[PDB]
Design a binder for this molecule. Structure first.
Ligand SMILES: Cc1cc(=O)c(C(=O)NCc2c(F)cc(-c3ccccc3)cc2F)nn1-c1cccnc1
Length: 309
């Protein structure tokens, strides 16, 4: 009683990046592919070579831990989101703080530039989404987005839309220009710990704290794919579309592994072993089949992985 008679990636460890003194929170590749930025509970941002993993510099100034970091499209600026209730805009070359973005009334959890990089979007424990002017550092809009902390914020491919997620169990799609809510994605209502648009902007990938990732057609409000087998019941774990080779979904996990799924078949195709604590963050290199992963305080390292597809 059995059946009658696709390629997988082969990610392998290349480098372990040590230096953070507390849990890592977020890793992001620069758009130019040259750098990896890491944020940590240790209040620091570190910059590493994306290709050889070589430590470049520490950027300091936040008064408390950092949950997230994000690059401008020209790779020249970073924004960071901190428990000190601020975001900071950094000149990466000089390491200098250009602007402190003040307005959130509690921890800032998540941040992103728009592709244009004239705006920053932030989400906070204060349950709001804010849109900031990069040039002036002024808050342009406060969206009453959620009824629990905002876990993720992301612009789509042309900057016209924002997606937000919250532990309130909702994903919302916002019109950037007006700040008006275009769509709420909702029955079981598990907390939403992470969301991002697909690179093509047609789909959103949402992580829920029932050990599940789902690919939504948000226009149709229909779930097209489900990815599971990993552990996620507590943390905001960054997930990704890997598009440089085979079409994969990449995520961290509370079982200390990096999970890679076939986007179409939803099968687990790789589990990357090596981290010694929760893998809180994954990132995919913009041009090469390279993954960065980072872990919580029993580990505190970033790992770089390479695949042939
Ligand atoms: C060039 C390019 C290549 C990509 O692989 C993607 C992208 O989004 N890939 C993820 C992806 C997919 F591979 C397939 C499905 C899917 C789901 C159900 C049924 C049928 C298909 C959904 C997905 F989200 N995007 N771009 C891109 C990049 C920048 C601006 N425009 C486009």
């Amino acid at each position: 009683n059995a059946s009658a008679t696709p390629v997988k990636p082969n990610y392998a460890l290349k480098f372990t990046l040590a230096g953070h003194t507390k849990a890592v929170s977020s890793v992001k590749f620069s758009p130019n592919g040259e750098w990896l930025a890491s944020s940590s509970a240790d209040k620091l941002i570190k910059i590493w070579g994306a290709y050889d993993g070589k430590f470049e510099k520490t950027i300091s100034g936040h008064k408390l831990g950092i949950s997230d970091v994000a690059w401008s499209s020209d790779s020249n600026l970073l924004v960071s989101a901190s428990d000190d209730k601020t975001l900071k805009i950094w000149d990466v070359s000089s390491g200098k703080c250009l602007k402190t973005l003040k307005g959130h009334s509690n921890y800032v959890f998540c941040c992103n530039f728009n592709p244009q990089s004239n705006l920053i979007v932030s989400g906070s424990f204060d349950e709001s989404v804010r849109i900031w002017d990069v040039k002036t550092g002024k808050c342009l809009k406060t969206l009453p987005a959620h009824s629990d902390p905002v876990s993720a914020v992301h612009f789509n491919r042309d900057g016209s839309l924002i997606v937000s997620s919250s532990y309130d169990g909702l994903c919302r799609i916002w019109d950037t220009a007006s700040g008006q809510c275009l769509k709420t994605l909702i029955d079981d209502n598990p907390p939403v710990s992470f969301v991002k648009f697909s690179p093509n902007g047609k789909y959103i990938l949402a992580a829920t704290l029932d050990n599940t990732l789902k690919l939504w057609d948000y226009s149709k409000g229909k779930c097209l794919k489900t990815y599971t087998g990993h552990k996620n019941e507590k943390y905001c774990i960054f997930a990704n579309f890997s598009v440089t080779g085979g079409k994969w979904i990449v995520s961290g996990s509370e079982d200390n592994l990096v999970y890679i799924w076939n986007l179409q078949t939803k099968e687990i195709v790789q589990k990357l072993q090596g981290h010694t604590d929760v893998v809180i963050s994954t990132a995919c290199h913009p041009t090469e089949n390279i993954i960065a992963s980072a872990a919580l305080e029993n580990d505190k390292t970033i790992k770089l992985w390479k695949s042939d597809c």
